[PDB]
């Protein structure tokens, strides 16, 4: 797929789902974090996160309010 736009952490965390920007999937919030944000938040590579079990991916997201 086409490369996704980047949005700051605070926007992803603080914005109601129907109010998020165009093309922003509020169930895939980690995919819209800048690389610096992602690395800062999840301490691992995108691919490493994406190879994690769903439960683990979701529990990481819930602890960071990104679920």
UniProtKB/Swiss-Prot annotation:
Compartments (UniProt record): Cytoplasm, Cytoskeleton; Cell projection, Microvillus; Cell projection, Lamellipodium; Cell projection, Ruffle
Expression tissues: Specifically expressed in epithelial cells. Component of brush border microvilli.
Region (Headpiece): 1-67
Effect after changing residue 28 to A: Reduces affinity for F-actin
PTM notes: Phosphorylated on tyrosine residues. The unphosphorylated form increases the initial rate of actin-nucleating activity, whereas the tyrosine-phosphorylated form inhibits actin-nucleating activity, enhances actin-bundling activity and enhances actin-severing activity by reducing high Ca(2+) requirements. The tyrosine-phosphorylated form does not regulate actin-capping activity.
Cystine pairs: none
Sequence ranges assigned to domain HP in this UniProt record: 1-67
Segments for region (Absolutely required for activity): 61-64
Assembly notes: Monomer. Homodimer. Associates with F-actin; the association with F-actin is inhibited by tropomyosin.
Family to which the UniProt record says this protein belongs: Belongs to the villin/gelsolin family.
Domain-level remarks: Consists of a large core fragment in the N-terminal portion and a small headpiece (HP) in the C-terminal portion. The core fragment is necessary for both actin-nucleating and -severing activities, whereas the HP binds F-actin strongly in both the presence and absence of calcium and is necessary in actin-bundling activity. The Gelsolin-like 1 repeat is necessary for the actin-capping activity. The entire core fragment is necessary for the actin-severing activity.
Protein name: Villin-1
Source organism of the structure: Gallus gallus (Chicken)
């Amino acid at each position: 797929p086409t490369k996704l736009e980047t949005f700051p952490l605070d926007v992803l965390v603080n914005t109601a789902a129907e109010d998020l920007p165009r093309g922003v999937d509020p169930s895939r919030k980690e995919n819209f974090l800048s690389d610096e944000d992602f690395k800062a938040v999840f301490g691992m590579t995108r691919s490493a996160f994406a190879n994690l079990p769903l439960w683990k991916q979701q529990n990481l997201k819930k602890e960071k309010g990104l679920f």
